[PDB]
Amino acid sequence: MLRISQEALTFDDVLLIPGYSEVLPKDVSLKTRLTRGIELNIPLVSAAMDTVTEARLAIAMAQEGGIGIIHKNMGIEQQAAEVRKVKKHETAKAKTYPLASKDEQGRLRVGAAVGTGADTGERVAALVAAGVDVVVVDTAHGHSKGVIERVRWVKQTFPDVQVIGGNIATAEAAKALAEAGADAVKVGIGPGSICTTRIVAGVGVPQISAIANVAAALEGTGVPLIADGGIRFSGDLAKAMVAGAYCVMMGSMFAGTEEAPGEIELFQGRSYKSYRGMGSLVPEGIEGRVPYKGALSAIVHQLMGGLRAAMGYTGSADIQQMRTQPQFVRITGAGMAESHVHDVQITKEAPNYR
Amino acid sequence: MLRISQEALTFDDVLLIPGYSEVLPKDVSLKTRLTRGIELNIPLVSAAMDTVTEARLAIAMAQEGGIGIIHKNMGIEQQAAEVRKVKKHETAKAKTYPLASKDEQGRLRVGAAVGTGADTGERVAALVAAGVDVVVVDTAHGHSKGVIERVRWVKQTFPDVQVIGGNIATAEAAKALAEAGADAVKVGIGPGSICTTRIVAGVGVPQISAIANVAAALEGTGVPLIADGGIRFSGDLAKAMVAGAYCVMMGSMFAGTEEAPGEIELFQGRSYKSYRGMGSLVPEGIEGRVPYKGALSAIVHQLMGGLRAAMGYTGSADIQQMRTQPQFVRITGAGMAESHVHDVQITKEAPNYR
Amino acid sequence: MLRISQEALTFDDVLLIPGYSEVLPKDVSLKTRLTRGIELNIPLVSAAMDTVTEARLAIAMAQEGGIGIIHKNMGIEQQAAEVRKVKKHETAKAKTYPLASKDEQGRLRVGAAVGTGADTGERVAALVAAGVDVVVVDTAHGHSKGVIERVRWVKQTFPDVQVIGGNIATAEAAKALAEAGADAVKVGIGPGSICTTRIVAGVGVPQISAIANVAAALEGTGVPLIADGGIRFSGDLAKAMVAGAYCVMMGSMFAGTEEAPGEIELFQGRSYKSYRGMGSLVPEGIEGRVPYKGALSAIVHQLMGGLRAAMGYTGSADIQQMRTQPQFVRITGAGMAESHVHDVQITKEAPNYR
Amino acid sequence: MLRISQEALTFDDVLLIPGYSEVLPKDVSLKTRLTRGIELNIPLVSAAMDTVTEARLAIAMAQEGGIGIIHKNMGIEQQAAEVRKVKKHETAKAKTYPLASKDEQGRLRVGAAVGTGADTGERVAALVAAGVDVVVVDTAHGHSKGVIERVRWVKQTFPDVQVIGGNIATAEAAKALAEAGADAVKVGIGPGSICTTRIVAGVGVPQISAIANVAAALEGTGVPLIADGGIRFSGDLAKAMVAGAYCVMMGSMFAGTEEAPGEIELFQGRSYKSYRGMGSLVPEGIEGRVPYKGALSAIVHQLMGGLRAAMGYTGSADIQQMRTQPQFVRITGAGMAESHVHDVQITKEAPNYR
Amino acid sequence: MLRISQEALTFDDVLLIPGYSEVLPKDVSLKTRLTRGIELNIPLVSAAMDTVTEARLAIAMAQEGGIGIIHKNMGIEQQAAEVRKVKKHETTYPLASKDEQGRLRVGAAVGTGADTGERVAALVAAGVDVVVVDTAHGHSKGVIERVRWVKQTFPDVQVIGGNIATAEAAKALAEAGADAVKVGIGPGSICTTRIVAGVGVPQISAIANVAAALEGTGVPLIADGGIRFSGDLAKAMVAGAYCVMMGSMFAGTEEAPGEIELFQGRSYKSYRGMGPEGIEGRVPYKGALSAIVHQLMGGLRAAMGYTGSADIQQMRTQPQFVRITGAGMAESHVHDVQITKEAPNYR
Ligand SMILES: O=c1[nH]cnc2c1ncn2[C@@H]1O[C@H](COP(=O)(O)O)[C@@H](O)[C@H]1O
Ligand SMILES: O=c1[nH]cnc2c1ncn2[C@@H]1O[C@H](COP(=O)(O)O)[C@@H](O)[C@H]1O
Ligand SMILES: O=c1[nH]cnc2c1ncn2[C@@H]1O[C@H](COP(=O)(O)O)[C@@H](O)[C@H]1O
Ligand SMILES: O=c1[nH]cnc2c1ncn2[C@@H]1O[C@H](COP(=O)(O)O)[C@@H](O)[C@H]1O
Ligand SMILES: O=c1[nH]cnc2c1ncn2[C@@H]1O[C@H](COP(=O)(O)O)[C@@H](O)[C@H]1O
């Protein structure tokens, strides 16, 4: 009697099956795309949130081979100034970043978020003049007249900039944004760590199924999809890629880095940095904090180490193979309990595990 | 070998799928029906419980555009006097309530509960003489000879009053109450926060399936169904509507408001009001308390904000569309864990989330 | 690739569906059978455990209309003396027990357990001479050469006594014990509260499926089945009956009564009595304690009140109808969470709920 | 849309069904094989981990009728010296070990692990010269060019030694190692108590399905499979055998024995020994400790008592029957809750249960 | 061998002894002095902290018959502007603290830093009633000299100096011309001075030692910090205080700076030390200031009823304490019963 379209799965519902391997984890390729026009050397994007990405973290993300999306919870002039900081940043003396995401002019790549409200035309124009590489039309519900028409307008008005539209969670939404001319789509309704959309509105799609449905819809187009939200462990990243993601966007994972906005807060013997939803104070997110994690480079190293391991296990030599060839098994709650550490009292944990 | 009719789902088993939207949350219509003859401007009913609805809260519910059902755990004269308080209440001076539920004479609408025991004939007569808009024949098991015959008797004896029968949880029960002449049916066996029917009797139907089964049964009749119990978050309300409910009845959500009976109780630095099952002291409910929530208006605002968001997400312009067009996905335990806030230490929560 | 016969369910996996009712809970019939030859006025049996049933509790069980099975963890003379105490017990003065389980001579009914070891022939003979109504050939694995041959031997050697064989959990086991001449079979491998068989041996069948499989096997024979173990709430009892049980055996529920062996133990402001597995100190059970519950009569009243409610809800006028006509829905973990009390801080609980 | 090969199960998803039994637990046979050429009197192997198996524990394992695999986290000379200790060990005076695993010369059997890195050729040669019975080519991903080629090389170079390859979790991996000439395959990707592969890489297969898939693949070959990891209770061992394992490898279960490396550590009134992953400090395991368990002989006695019970319950007279004839039921989370001790306050636990 | 001057006590070390009473709680007088020139109708002062007192709370404090001290963690123009907001505020408040021109009274804190001279000038120009030379260590050359400077340069303005905890410090500030002294080294809820520096004096003994030194000087003393219960306020008065300054008790009010934060079923507002020798936190939301004041003053009236003190002068000088042990304090609190409903004045 219920109108149920499908059962939908998320990360903890599935595991990757090992396959025959001849390429070691250290030798696989991690190169992928953010959009039709923008390549990334590693499949990582930092979230457009005011506790995650401003110039400092965006510089670091690009240096690592990913990219940062500067948040829009600031004045237009201020957001453009952040973009300019990234574009003008020069590599120091003796430091070298062989994987750095750079444009044709050799400048670090950066993105920036806009909405669909009254200041959007001016905001986009300012960001484009500041040299932004990609404009992210970023709302809670990308499958809407407002977002579709704004994506079209950016493509027409500023023909040399890349455009991402989101967020979405269905095949029909993916086709609608592709029809608007999006250079990539961003996938995720509700899975974010600090997000309460699924609880307050009762709306969303478990992220592994969301990713796969969007990936299938975009087959034949060459338009990338960005899997946004819900990543807690490096293994989730691997699963997202095999479900069809071209890259992943994370907020919580990066909010605790030195390069993220904010200062270290001490509490009960541990160190933290603040992390809050952008729809937080009828709110659809809350406010919190995450453990301090040190330099971004160390978090990236752990994440990519885990992804490289997964590619080693599945026998995937590069991202295109990882996206299209490995298989999942579906598991139960007991399968997941067995996956975690179990029946031993931990005394010393790992940087990549709790 | 087991006689199992179906797998049955409740709120946490499903999520709403986003759809194409052109109508903003602030612009959708929330109008619906309580019964064949009674319209509501918002789909909210307060429970007929002695810790939830007496005159003060019923006045407020009607002013907000919903309705209150005055409980029957009091003398007949006393219950009629509560009804009269609501009917005679006049709007103050400078306060205006544009959505107020009013009868043809401009008086605030109110309902009242009766059972099937010996004082029922007199109780109904007194409530009708007091100007009650709807008599709720309210028992633990509406699919029974007693309730069916009493619903018939009220329809025959007092032809100008609306009648609700309940509670039920099946298609055949819905048809039986409709055949008795009910102007609406009330759905819910066991899901109430303080209810222990499912534990003590082993009886009940998960509420999302209960709602959908009753909705399908009543197709072609124009008889509304009221989804009673189990609502914890505004997202549950959205799900109930898409499963086919015309409106929802809540007890726990309203027991903590200023307008509910009882005084604020202080305990471990927080404020509470009492909340107890009507089958509490072989009991089928227990006794407890819920956090103080302040004015009813603020709770209603949060609930309707969440419902408006859900309608925005599904592209539903009004309640009839919301009831009949959006789809669910079925999810697992991990899907639900991903829906809640996860993997972040909360520091500041939201009025609509914990 | 796995040899899996079926998915198997237990109590928390299912709920009873309400049906049309014309018979009130106070008016239904609870009469049933323990064995081909022994009627019970209520479907309750107390477990043959040394912390549950000796003469005092067996007397009370019979007086209530059920029956007690005296445990075998004592000398043969001692076990026979316990049986004699029950048979010789006379009702006091002004107390009357209208439902008492009595034999043709007007004496209270009682059962007693035996195993299959070396003292079994003498033990059975002593119990029969003491006037026992039913010999329970009681082992961990009733589907065995030893139990089958001992059941046959008792039927041949002592032709006037009833015989129960167990424990079993399959259709083929039920047919094998029926072929041995059992007057009833006892169902339950692993579900007992203090039992660790399923953990230590990895063996067992979820009890609702076990009951239904055995009930289907015994159709056409008139041989009762006794559902032994795993009952925690009165609702579980209702579910067991609808799955096909003729009656239920409980240990934990009765161990805390005044009539059970042992004295009240005080600990952290609460009162307890001891309760331990019979395979406890390679053990297959452990040792513990359960809350003190007062007179057995109060526990029976709560259990039967819950069963009467369930029969009222399903429209079952008597046990035969309850066993054969009502339906289940299968539920998820969220369905069960909704069944329990949820999202309210309990202040006063109920005798039948926690 | 997702590429899902199957639903996969682990231990807590299934239970063994009782069957007709004529052979008592004390009378069944536990004999099995480690490899084509090596018989074991009991189906137990100790893990090749530096907190589990060195000479002392390997001696004890062999004396009990199983075998130990000496770990490779030590110099080549040192690992060979450990092997020599086992081979040269003579039984004392008045102690007798009737089940001892011995080679043709009457010496205790022992295995040793190697990897695929640069020191492997020399390490294998040294272990073989030291008299090792079986070389375990042991890596995180046995389905790889490196492991396959190394297994071939050992078979060719040292034709008189047995070779195990692993770890694997699929049918195709099993066929690939069998084609390389492996004398047994070791099954397990991620289930180990201290392992974090499934979390960090997102890779693995629930162990009961892994075992069954490998068992089916190896039908017709006579090549044993060793079920490595995830065993927490003796019942898990029984389940592993019925899924098709020839024997099981355990680390956590043995790390707390007196014979394991390391000294007793006292903490909060209890005794512990250290236990850590071999991929612990991008780590794929962590570090911890497990309760002290005393002599290995007592743990073996409990494990085999549980397996004997399971064989008694299923009517399996020997390991070959246990592997091929009994059936499972699939269960839910509630089935598992019912399997554990429930609804009783434990006061005295058992050596084989918590 | 240790140079120990005395054993020192604080609030939980003592209890007030009941005495013969003829004046009911509702009939006692709560009037007192803030400074030798300024009178208050209730003995309450709000702390000069950026999470406690700005214009809004200061207005409410004055209206209740106490006074607020505007904090100095803001620009000079900003602080003077806060003072003017209070001085210009118009309304019934029968107990309201007002100056000779009928304007609400307000205080403002200064330090001894470089801009102090300018800050004082601006505040005085804004019509401030009292300048609080407010530092962690009032018994210092710097503070004593600044107090003297203010009394020279603007002798028309009342001056408070602090903080101090000894007889010698009290006499030094009185000599410098202070119109009141403020007592408290380390007892504040959020303060860590006693832990980080190892320095301080338990507040009851600090108050009593200062009160003895100031007998006959005409100089009132303000007991600043460590008040958790209304009973503490009563104790502080009997130990010799003329009034009490609180931060934590007021930070959770509607009138205090900041907004409500929700966390684990309760509501909170932020509270942090001005110093590090302090930490940062939050306190339960308590609603209107008027409610807190009512409870505090009800507790004080009850204590005065119990001791038979008809006014503040008697309360400061006549009642006695007993010294109690840890078991004595355990008996004083609720004990051996599971609370189900607590009280606004007892959590
Ligand atoms: O206030 C919010 N409500 C709903 N979603 C949010 C909010 N803030 C951030 N998000 C989403 O959550 C993602 C981050 O998820 P995370 O990596 O799981 O922490 C963002 O990239 C956004 O898509
Ligand atoms: O004592 C009781 N037993 C069973 N159900 C109850 C009892 N009291 C109230 N209810 C039901 O529970 C609903 C309220 O559920 P809630 O909104 O989840 O708190 C009521 O409208 C009633 O249908
Ligand atoms: O030591 C034991 N091991 C396994 N099962 C037991 C043991 N002791 C009692 N039982 C079973 O557990 C049942 C009682 O279960 P309960 O009503 O859930 O407490 C008994 O009637 C027996 O069938
Ligand atoms: O650091 C590690 N990472 C992954 N797996 C490990 C690690 N260390 C040991 N294992 C595996 O875990 C098994 C032991 O699992 P256990 O019996 O569940 O404690 C070993 O035999 C190895 O197969
Ligand atoms: O950072 C700080 N260090 C030391 N003392 C402080 C600090 N902040 C405030 N105080 C003091 O603590 C008092 C407030 O104490 P409370 O009433 O116990 O919360 C203030 O009036 C100040 O005297």
TrEMBL record, chain E:
Gene3D superfamilies: Aldolase class I. InterPro entries: Aldolase_TIM, CBS_dom, CBS_dom_sf, IMP_DH, IMP_DH/GMP_Rdtase_CS, IMP_DH_GMPRt. Mycophenolic acid (MPA) is a non-competitive inhibitor that prevents formation of the closed enzyme conformation by binding to the same site as the amobile flap. In contrast, mizoribine monophosphate (MZP) is a competitive inhibitor that induces the closed conformation. MPA is a potent inhibitor of mammalian IMPDHs but a poor inhibitor of the bacterial enzymes. MZP is a more potent inhibitor of bacterial IMPDH. One of its GO terms (molecular function) is IMP dehydrogenase activity. Transmembrane segments: none annotated. Mg(2+) 1 binds at residue 54. IMP 1 binds at residues 189, 224, 226, 247-248. NAD(+) binds at residues 134-136, 184-186. Keywords: ATP-binding, CBS domain, GMP biosynthesis, Metal-binding, NAD, Nucleotide-binding, Oxidoreductase, Potassium, Purine biosynthesis, Repeat. It catalyses: IMP + NAD(+) + H2O = XMP + NADH + H(+). Pathway: Purine metabolism; XMP biosynthesis via de novo pathway; XMP from IMP: step 1/1. IMP binds at residues 189, 224-226, 247-248, 271-275, 277. IMP 2 binds at residues 189, 224, 226, 247-248, 271, 274-275. K(+) binds at residues 186, 188, 191, 331-333. It comes from the Bacteria. It holds the Pfam family IMPDH. Its EC number is 1.1.1.205. The keyword Nuclease does not apply. PANTHER family: INOSINE-5'-MONOPHOSPHATE DEHYDROGENASE (PTHR11911:SF111), INOSINE-5-MONOPHOSPHATE DEHYDROGENASE RELATED (PTHR11911). Homotetramer. Belongs to the IMPDH/GMPR family. NCBIfam families: IMP_dehydrog (TIGR01302). This is Inosine-5'-monophosphate dehydrogenase. It comes from Pseudomonas aeruginosa (strain ATCC 15692 / DSM 22644 / CIP 104116 / JCM 14847 / LMG 12228 / 1C / PRS 101 / PAO1). The lineage of its organism: Bacteria, Pseudomonadati, Pseudomonadota, Gammaproteobacteria, Pseudomonadales.
